Design a protein around this ligand. Structure first.
Ligand code: ADP
Ligand code: CL
Ligand code: MN
Ligand code: MN
Length: 442
C-alpha cells in the first residue's frame, strides 16, 4: 500500500507488490536493482526486469553482466530476462504465452505510455492472483503531488517565463548560459521550432523524441553539445551531464472526443510526477552544487479523459490471462477510465490485425483498434482515403496527397482521424507511407 525506501527480501514473496520511491538519483536503477536481482537469483525465482527504453535496457545489460541476465530485443530459474516495457506488452499480445515469471521488476514505473500502463495492470493482476511478486521502482508513483522531491545536490528552482516559440530578442538568460541545458517541450513540432532558434544562435542542439530516442540519445554521451530539446520521453531514466533544466511545464494530451476521433489538447500543465522527473534530470551529482531548474508554470493532475489509459484497456482486453479473465489496471490508475472491462476484446483474426497495425503500421492504439474492429485487413489501406471531408489531412495548408501502390494519386482523408498521425513532419511522413502501402526500413 504505502511506498518504501529500502529493499528487503520479504518483498519477493508471492502476492507482494511494493513501490520503491527513493528520490531521483538515489540509486534505484544502478544500486537497488542489482541487489534485488542478486537476491532473486539466489532464491531461484523466475524474474523479468522491465526497462522503459532500449537505451536504459542496454545500460542495464552492461551494468548486469557477470550476472545471468538475458537482454531480449523482442530461462527458467537460471536466467533473468530483461526487456523494455513495450516489448513485454507486445509479447503478451502474441499467441505464444509469456513465461510465468513469479517476480516482475519494473523500472521507471511512472511511465504513462499505453504499453507501460498495460504492463502494470497485467503485473498487478498476476500479483493479486497470488502468482507473482512485483516491485515498481519510481520516485513519482501515480498520484504524487510533489513537484520538488529530494535530490543528491540542492537544486536552484526559479519560476520564469519560458519561450513557447522562436524568439528574435530577449530571453538572453537562455543563450548566455555556458553549461549544458535540457529543455522539455510539449511536442516534437514545438521542439523543432525551439531547436531551430537555438541553432540559429550558434548552439549545438540535440533533439529527442520517442521515434528518434535510441539513435539521438547516443549523441548526448559526448562533450560537444549545448542543448538537448526533448519531449517527455526523457522523464524515463534519461541520464544527462547537464547543469540546467528549462521546463515549459507543458504537455499535450491525446483526447478521444465522443469515441469518434483523437485530438491533441493543449499545450496544458504537466502532472506533478512529470515536473518532478523533468527537474530530476539535474542535481544528480552529490558533489556538484548549483544545478538550476527554470520552470514556466504550474502543475495539474491528469483528467479522466487522457487517451492513454483507455488505450491501455484496449491492450489489456486483448491479453490472455487465465481462461476468461481480463487483467485490471493497476488500482491507483484504474479510476482514469470509464471503459468497461472486456469491451475492447477482439476475435482472433481482428486481434492479429490490431497488433499488426500497431507494430508494423506504427499506428496509435486507438486508431489501430478502430481499423481492426471494422474488419479491415492490415494491407487494405482504402480507409486512409474515404473519410469525411473534415478528416482531410493538411500538409502546408494544402490537402496532403499520396500515390497509392495501385497507381492513383489520392487525398489523405482517413475514415478515423487520430491527430497523432499528422502532428509533425516525421509522423505525417510515416502515415503517408503507410497510406501508400509502403514501409520504411527499420
Ligand atoms: N554511467 C554512470 N557512471 C557513474 N554514475 C552514474 C552513471 N549513470 C548515473 N550515475 C549516477 O548514479 C547515481 C544513481 O543513479 P540511478 O541509480 O540512475 O538513480 P535513480 O534512483 O534515479 O534510478 C546518480 O548520482 C547518477 O548521477
Ligand atoms: Cl515523443
Ligand atoms: Mn539522498
Ligand atoms: Mn532510475
Amino acid at each position: 500500500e504505502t511506498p518504501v525506501e529500502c529493499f528487503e527480501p520479504s518483498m519477493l514473496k508471492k502476492k507482494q507488490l511494493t513501490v520503491l520511491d527513493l528520490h531521483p538519483g538515489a540509486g534505484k536503477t544502478r544500486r537497488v536493482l542489482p541487489e534485488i536481482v542478486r537476491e532473486a537469483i539466489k532464491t531461484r525465482l523466475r524474474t523479468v526486469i522491465l526497462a522503459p527504453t532500449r537505451v536504459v535496457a542496454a545500460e542495464m545489460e552492461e551494468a548486469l553482466r557477470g550476472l545471468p541476465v538475458r537482454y531480449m530485443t523482442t530461462s527458467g530459474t537460471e536466467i533473468v530476462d530483461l526487456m523494455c516495457h513495450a516489448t513485454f506488452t507486445s509479447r503478451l499480445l502474441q499467441p505464444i504465452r509469456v513465461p510465468n515469471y513469479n517476480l516482475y521488476i519494473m523500472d521507471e514505473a511512472h511511465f504513462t505510455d499505453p504499453s507501460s500502463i498495460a504492463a502494470r495492470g497485467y503485473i498487478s493482476t498476476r500479483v493479486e492472483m497470488g502468482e507473482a511478486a512485483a516491485i515498481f521502482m519510481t520516485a513519482t508513483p501515480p498520484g504524487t503531488r510533489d513537484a520538488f522531491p529530494d535530490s543528491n545536490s540542492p537544486i536552484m528552482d526559479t519560476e520564469v517565463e519560458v519561450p513557447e516559440r522562436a524568439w528574435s530578442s530577449g530571453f538572453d538568460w537562455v543563450t548566455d548560459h555556458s553549461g549544458k541545458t535540457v529543455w522539455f517541450v510539449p511536442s516534437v513540432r514545438n521542439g523543432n521550432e525551439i531547436a531551430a532558434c537555438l541553432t540559429k544562435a550558434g548552439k549545438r542542439v540535440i533533439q529527442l523524441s520517442r521515434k528518434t530516442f535510441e539513435t539521438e540519445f547516443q549523441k548526448t554521451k559526448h562533450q560537444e553539445w549545448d542543448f538537448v530539446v526533448t519531449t517527455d520521453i526523457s522523464e524515463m531514466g534519461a541520464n544527462f551531464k547537464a547543469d540546467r533544466v528549462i521546463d515549459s511545464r507543458r504537455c499535450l494530451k491525446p483526447v478521444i472526443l465522443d469515441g469518434e476521433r483523437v485530438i491533441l489538447a493543449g499545450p496544458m500543465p504537466v502532472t506533478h510526477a512529470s515536473a518532478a522527473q523533468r527537474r530530476g534530470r539535474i542535481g544528480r551529482n552529490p558533489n556538484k552544487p548549483g544545478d538550476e531548474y527554470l520552470y514556466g508554470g504550474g502543475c495539474a493532475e491528469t483528467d479522466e479523459d487522457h487517451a492513454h489509459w483507455l488505450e491501455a484497456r484496449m491492450l489489456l482486453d486483448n491479453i490472455y490471462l487465465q481462461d476468461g479473465l481480463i487483467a485490471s489496471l493497476y488500482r491507483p490508475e484504474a479510476d482514469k477510465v470509464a471503459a468497461i472491462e472486456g469491451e475492447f476484446k477482439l476475435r482472433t483474426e481482428q486481434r492479429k490485425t490490431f497488433v499488426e497495425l500497431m507494430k508494423r503500421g506504427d499506428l496509435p492504439v486507438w486508431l489501430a483498434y478502430q481499423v481492426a474492429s471494422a474488419g479491415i485487413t492490415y494491407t487494405d489501406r482504402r480507409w486512409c482515403f474515404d473519410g469525411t471531408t473534415n478528416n482531410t489531412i493538411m500538409e502546408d495548408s494544402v490537402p496532403a496527397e499520396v500515390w497509392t501502390r495501385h497507381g492513383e494519386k489520392r487525398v489523405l482523408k482517413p475514415r478515423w482521424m487520430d491527430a497523432r498521425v499528422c502532428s509533425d513532419h516525421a509522423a505525417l511522413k510515416s502515415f503517408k507511407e503507410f497510406a501508400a502501402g509502403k514501409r520504411a526500413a527499420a
